[model samples]
Target chain A: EVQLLESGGGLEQPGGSLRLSCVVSGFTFSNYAFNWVRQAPGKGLEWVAIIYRSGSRMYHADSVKGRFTISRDDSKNTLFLQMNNLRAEDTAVYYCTTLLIYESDVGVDFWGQGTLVTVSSASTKGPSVFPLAPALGCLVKDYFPEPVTVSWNSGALTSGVHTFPAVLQSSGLYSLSSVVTVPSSSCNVNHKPSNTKVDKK
Target chain B: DIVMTQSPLSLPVSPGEPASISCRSTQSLIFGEHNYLDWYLQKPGQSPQLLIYLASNRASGVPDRFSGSGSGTYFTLKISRVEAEDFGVYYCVQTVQVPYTFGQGTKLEIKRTVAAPSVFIFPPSDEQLKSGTASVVCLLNNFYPREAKVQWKDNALQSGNSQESVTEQDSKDSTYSLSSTLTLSDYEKHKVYACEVTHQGLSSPVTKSFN
Candidate 1:
């Protein structure tokens, strides 16, 4: 029996391309073809395409053209599937299948564990042109606005007007860090802010 | 494109008892030198498993009990006996592209009983009847889940047409049958008409044609 090992998991960022690897251990890569299959959360398995080791012939499913490519590194006995144009809909478990060729028939006999690719932080421009009021008001309104929601850090700000000191760094840019913690019964935020915008340096 | 139908929609069989499936194409599967016929089995939770490929060449690793045989446009998938692991849905697929289609699957189960005597049935021969309008019927008995398709084809045209109707029978034994009818004009008699039926539990398809 052939053994397929796969690596990589969890969500990556949108627009950020990802590559998942499947390494075969017991089989001869030159003699067989490796195929990639994808399954959405609750959908049927889809045949993405297949790749051979020697000449590297690839055949993609008619519906999945242009968004994915399957290739292999013969030296490492590893097969790779690179998927681009990452969108929320692209999130699914991808698997690598090895086709077993018999004298009379050919079929996928073994499969890999599968990997998950997710998209997280997206790019955004920071608030610029500050009269301190407009920019700060915008930042506070957008990121740390009223209602005293829980901020990135674990600090609590009750109903009151508060200002965290903005420090000027050696790069001639101002950076401020604030933490907000709210009651469990209040607003519930589970997302992380990863995109940074620079108004003026 | 032909639409295939399978009957008994679902059935239960005992271990070591025979299981049969049928598929009919909408049009004559004969294309020049080749006939578009194929069957597939999808076990629970797995990919649509291919039990039989090319009508009869069993996919590697498939059990010998899985066998397919038929002609023109009708085919059958039969398991000599039921294996405990054989319980699952089976589907019939046709390769007559140009609007290629599949039949609704049949689910097979295992029930205890004495095995019944096996009967051999031959596929109907292709008859080129004078055509103004033609009708063909396929007798599929002792099956459930009535679903089927019927179609007609003319000289050299790759695509075919389809008609379907469902009928249920109440007798000593409860069963359902689906029939598909295709109308061909006098201009079509020179061509062929095919009837296809697909049902769960069977291995491939069952088809017949009138030319």
Candidate 2:
């Protein structure tokens, strides 16, 4: 039995550094290769870097070559990925994965739960809130950045969402908003949790 | 680096028909008496499916009809019956390479053909389900159009609680076949059963019930 897990902070400052981890257990950590994979929204999958069991670390030709590093700590059964510089474009879901060997299998048979890393100079002004109205508004302000995404619950909305791009404030921060007109009767906001998730190669 | 190459660029297949996907590696993918090559089918919008491994072995839970057999740098994945779910891109990879390398992939396309999903109950005497917690797997096979509506009920033999895997399997053929399991309890001799699979390719929803 083999298992892989991914751990990392949610936000990375623009032009800053970030460290992500894939913790392995239930198997020999050094017997298989560990690789970091990433996928941006509406984009194809990309294999960023890999730390092989044979002690070679390699990267995809089109990946973040100079700024990304892949390494491992066999004692800790963990693989670490470091990104020196980040752009908002680097924001993506990252996964730790490995191919199943010894069993005559060569595909990535083990995968870690993904960790989403958001890169930006702005942090949410405060705890996200749901403001009530004919058009339920999600207002986030005082964030020291532009180019942020403000989205609403797809299940909660009875119809299409009205959104606007974040604008730069005189203070050099950013504010974002998205409004969805909730049906008067169902504005009850009965929330239910969802366990939706998926992975890549 | 071991190089892999898939053939024909693309293959047009129909459900119920047989299809063969061939993969060739630039260098020998063998170590000792075994080949280190594995075959994978990557469905668009989904994870890559490991169909064959170590040149001539099938992965766990893989159907017997899907077989792998090759030596040196030559390999092939033969599907005794092409399925709707089998339509996808296939690739050959060598894991024995210090750093793994992949070959150009082949795509399995669909024809106007279709087939109904075969359903079965697969909780065959494995675990101590009587220990109060266990799972019931309802498998659907030999279907087309990977996308299908599925539903499951729990304790329905006693009460009416139900759930859904709400996910899918890359069946490797352009048509479809899959298994959705329901987590249930055995404390009440609860024989968890019943599922509905609906696909536009079929005449109507195929709902199967077992005892």
Candidate 3:
């Protein structure tokens, strides 16, 4: 019956600051330690910091370099993350969870749904495209967040082009393959999670 | 490449007690709902086998006692009950990207309650005796826990020696080995020199001597 609800998400420019909150219910906030974790778009999870339930001790990852502060309002049963000097890389979905430590066992037992924060100028990496040889096809691979648009440079060919849905790759990214009914002489391919384009022949 | 580091490189746990090993990755292994982490165990002389996949799911045929948890950069592999058959090395891997990285490994071993070392003393060779060399060596093998005290005695008294030193090594069997040498004067070589080794596994120190 334990639950952790997180709130706080907004856009911030580089060098600015933001505060996030995690309100707890169904459990005493001072009886268990809490942690702040985050994940960049299409990237893995990162543990940012931890605070013990006693409110007497706290720890931060070396990467934080003192810019991240963890505090709690015991009366309201809530924990907060105060982050400063935001950067493009700091744009991520931040989460709040309780830590379970017993004897030699330690783990994260519960988590919040997470809130997304963006540093306005942050940009995702571009995607790559390959042309299917001796045929009319375009293959796009390694994009993130699962929504990528694929297009050709030539005027629209309503019936000749067949584009498949983006396939999730083992790397936690996506790949899409598209083919046309006619032979390929030259054309351009475009996709996003991208701003750049590639030439295919 | 994502770097992976495992902690408690050497572990000694009692049977039936819960045990855990942690693995940390340089990058988050999560993409969408998939966690790129995998857990493996390699018994001595056996192929590495999967126990947990995608951070927390148990592989087919794996015991339910074995579990994995964590997301992104931090993860752990836990054994609910340490069994004698569970002694081996465990590793964690990140499959999120090519050139995938794997942890060095964590060694899980049983906590020994009683185990003794095989002790030996080697007198200097005839070539040394003819050349007037003054040193003898002692070797102790297969001892557990690495808590041992080694000393040399000349006749009935402790030897004041500069050639006295013990080199320790960790064996594949999870035991410890030590090689100690004691310097002897020409006159002391004529007297009996005994190497005394003390370990928790023994009721008392064991002594081996050579003249």
Query: TM per model?
Result: 0.43, 0.50, 0.41
Ranking under DockQ, best-scoring first? Answer: 2, 1, 3
Provide the lDDT at A74 for model 2.
Answer: 91
lDDT of 2 by residue, A106-190 (tens): 3337667667777876544432222323324444333532234444443454344444344444445544444444345571221
Residues B31-112, candidate 3, lDDT per residue (tens digit)? 9897888787766433356688789977767889999999989999999998777887787877675444567777787775
Please give the CA lDDT of all the candidate structures. 0.52, 0.61, 0.67
Q: Which is superior by lDDT, 1 or 3? A: 3
What level of docking quality does candidate 2 show?
incorrect
For candidate 2, write residues B73-166 as lDDT tens digits: 7788888987666767777777676446666677777764456765554342322333454444455555655567677644343233333322
How big is the positional error of residue B156 in model 1, measured in Å on the Cα after superposition? Answer: 69
Q: Model 3: DockQ against the native?
A: 0.01
Q: RMSD in Å for candidate 1, one decimal?
A: 26.0
- Which candidate has the top score in lDDT? 3
**DockQ in order:** 0.03, 0.04, 0.01
Candidate 2: clashing residue pairs, number: 17
